[PDB]
Design an enzyme around this catalytic site. Sequence first.
Site, PDB file in Angstrom:
ATOM      1  N   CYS A  31      -2.367  -1.270  -5.498  1.00 13.53           N
ATOM      2  CA  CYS A  31      -2.546  -1.328  -4.023  1.00 13.53           C
ATOM      3  C   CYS A  31      -1.741  -0.259  -3.288  1.00 13.53           C
ATOM      4  O   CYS A  31      -0.520  -0.376  -3.147  1.00 13.53           O
ATOM      5  CB  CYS A  31      -2.125  -2.717  -3.500  1.00 13.53           C
ATOM      6  SG  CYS A  31      -1.870  -2.840  -1.724  1.00 13.53           S
ATOM      7  N   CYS A  34       0.370  -1.214  -0.137  1.00 11.01           N
ATOM      8  CA  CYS A  34       1.563  -1.952  -0.552  1.00 11.01           C
ATOM      9  C   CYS A  34       2.620  -0.925  -0.986  1.00 11.01           C
ATOM     10  O   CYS A  34       3.787  -1.010  -0.615  1.00 11.01           O
ATOM     11  CB  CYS A  34       1.233  -2.939  -1.694  1.00 11.01           C
ATOM     12  SG  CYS A  34      -0.197  -4.039  -1.474  1.00 11.01           S
TER      13      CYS A  34
END
Length: 107
Positions: A31, A34
């Site tokens: 991700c 993130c």
Amino acid sequence: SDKIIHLTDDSFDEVIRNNKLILVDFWAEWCGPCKMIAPILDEIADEYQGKLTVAKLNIDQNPGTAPKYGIRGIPTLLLFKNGEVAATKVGALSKGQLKEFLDANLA
């Protein structure tokens, strides 16, 4: 960075119960967002040291917690007060935006 607790499925429940105010970052090495907002959190854990604990749950490695707390996607931040979920911020965000979210939920 080393102010940030890394929770496991196993460790999770005890930890959030165990300290008053804590912020959890549900994340994963795949991700990008993130990864992107991670250094923000580094700073937050410094800047908020003593008022707010900051933690990460890597979901690749802890498949069970996310559904448990209704995490449908990452990034997603959870603020717990007193061992219970209090507010929740989904998706990427700027330090500013994060700071507000934090302030607007403490006192």
